[PDB]
Amino acid sequence: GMEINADFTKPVVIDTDQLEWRPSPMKGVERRMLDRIGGEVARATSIVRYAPGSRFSAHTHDGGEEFIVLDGVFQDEHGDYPAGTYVRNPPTTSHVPGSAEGCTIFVKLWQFDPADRTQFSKNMEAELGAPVEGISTSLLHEDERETVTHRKLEPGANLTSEAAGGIEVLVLDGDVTVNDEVLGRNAWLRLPEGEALSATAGARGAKIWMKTGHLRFVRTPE
């Protein structure tokens, strides 16, 4: 089937601003696929853009749905999710999505444990703690499998992680140097199990989203 960066032993870095927007099944929703594994129904990581005035029929999240609103405002029957909002919609949940204004989101599908029932949304900046050596951290989500954070890095600040079970990063603002490479806004990085992350912010600092541990639990939708 469609297997995009489906060898989780390989590091990948992507300047996602260079990728073609491709059609999705939803009218007015286009996608930049980042990783994908499985047949008909997919464990998927994508950036997707909803056109202004997007209104759809309901859907259910058979494998869960996690996302960051990158720009604009996403909506459902429970209200607004403005840019900077992080959302977990666990397996078996449902809603009617839309976007009056349009939005762009970073979204993961079918990467929840089937038994997970934790659902919420969070302003990623609102619970940033005190800086520790120029890094402020907001704990977005943590369970026995994964740890999800938002990090704000002052200029020159270094985040070094030796977290187990894989490391995945999306650059939200500014830039970080990783392995001699400058990663700006919308760069996506996935590092295989055992590889340390060392990211140093540039002159304007940086903001990132980060998940660790999840590559131990890669599953094709059953």
Ligand SMILES: O=C(O)c1cccnc1
């Ligand atoms: O990953 C995808 O293909 C995707 C995710 C959300 C909405 N449309 C497509």
Ligand SMILES: [Zn+2]
């Ligand atoms: Zn949904």
